[model samples]
Target: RYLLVRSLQTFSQAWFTCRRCYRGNLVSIHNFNINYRIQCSVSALNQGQVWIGGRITGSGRCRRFQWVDGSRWNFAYWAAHQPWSRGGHCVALCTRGGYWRRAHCLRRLPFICSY
Candidate 1:
């Protein structure tokens, strides 16, 4: 579903940057407005590729999502309050403490990549 990649940033920056880096825009699924136990959801624009970790770039300046191996866009899964609102330009998740915050993409958090 997903792949691991290297990112030269803190967890917060990485999470904020992923939105611009992937082909599939980050999307909020059933968890965005719900409890903080579930991760948000994300989908690929082309819905073709699966892994897109190593291909990420600085501050997510890239406007498209692509697999590190050069594959088509494919799978994605977003957690709660993901993709933020349009123009939000960030990915955030909720915690047991009841707070929605930005994700640290490079924080080595548990992420999902679907195909």
Candidate 2:
């Protein structure tokens, strides 16, 4: 099952909510079809950002990114010149073209959940 959480929440909060409360992880998009489905379900956002399941652990050159559900992270549709920031280790679905981008984990944004 899939769900679109419209309320604003930090990435960590949303992640915990999905796992501990719903027994699901934040949504993971393997391809455009699923990505489009999620975009269509959620209304436009003011911040134009929504937290997904991807996150990075460690710091500096040793940083690594992976989806929370342990799903395949082989595919990504990042915006042009994105996923490059050294600080923002969390991934979010950016609007205007429905692309992915790395964002600060503390920033509040809507989120999706999948079980």
Candidate 3:
């Protein structure tokens, strides 16, 4: 099951929160249809964005995207000028567009969790 947690939290905080909720982690979306289905949960915040279980791994030239729960890194839905720079290590999904945007880990945002 998926839970759209509207409470604000940093990437790591959300990560721990999800697990604390029991056998869960931040949501990991691998496809758009799935992304769309779960995204509209935020009807109150029309264009809201939320943290997912994704983050960047490695350094500079060899940096790569990774999902916390082992979802394969085969699909990417990054928005333009996104993943924008190496400094952005976390991933957030735009509820209205179902697109991904890179952000810093400490950014306080609502998040989704998968159980």
Candidate 4:
């Protein structure tokens, strides 16, 4: 039951939200790079996995959209309005790197961890 959250928020806030809405704790996972983005996997503190991630697609010092499950995001991170051209929905692409490259939400490439 892994849930994903978007945007960067305080650990306390995240915990409160998850517990109130999902009734889980912020379970931390390995293989993460926290410099650019934030991620957190939630569990019942003694049960099965519940949620993962608080990753943010960053831009300099600002960011928009938190990380979510791969299924929700359409794999269409092409350059310059390419996603719109390809009928993308509920997805985000890196506006940098001279082109929009597709990103995987489940892949533990680089992310932040909370509580």
- Best TM-score goes to which candidate? 3
Ranking by lDDT: 2, 3, 1, 4
Q: Residues 14-77, candidate 3, lDDT per residue (tens digit)?
A: 9999999757989888787778787677645743688999998895577777899887887778
* Tens-digit per-residue lDDT, 43-98, candidate 2: 47676878999998885677577999998788788888764756488999875677
lDDT measured at residue 30 in model 2 versus the true structure, 0 to 100 = 86
Q: What value does the lDDT take at residue 115 in candidate 4?
A: 29
Scored by Cα lDDT, where does model 4 land? Answer: 0.34
TM-score for each candidate, following the candidate numbering: 0.26, 0.87, 0.89, 0.26
Error of 2 at 28 (Å): 1.2
Off-target runs (Cα >4 Å) in candidate 1 are 1-62, 83-102, 110-115
Better model by lDDT, 3 or 4?
A: 3
For lDDT, the strongest prediction is 2
Backbone Cα, N, C clashes tallied per candidate: 25, 0, 0, 9
Candidate 2 CA-lDDT value: 0.83
Q: What's model 3's lDDT at 100?
A: 85
Model 4 over residues 51-109: C-alpha lDDT tens digits? 23334355575645444322232222234544332232122223132223333333222
**Candidate 1 lDDT score at position 7:** 38
Write down the lDDT of every candidate, Cα atoms only. 0.34, 0.83, 0.82, 0.34
- RMSD values, in order shown: 12.0, 1.8, 1.8, 13.2
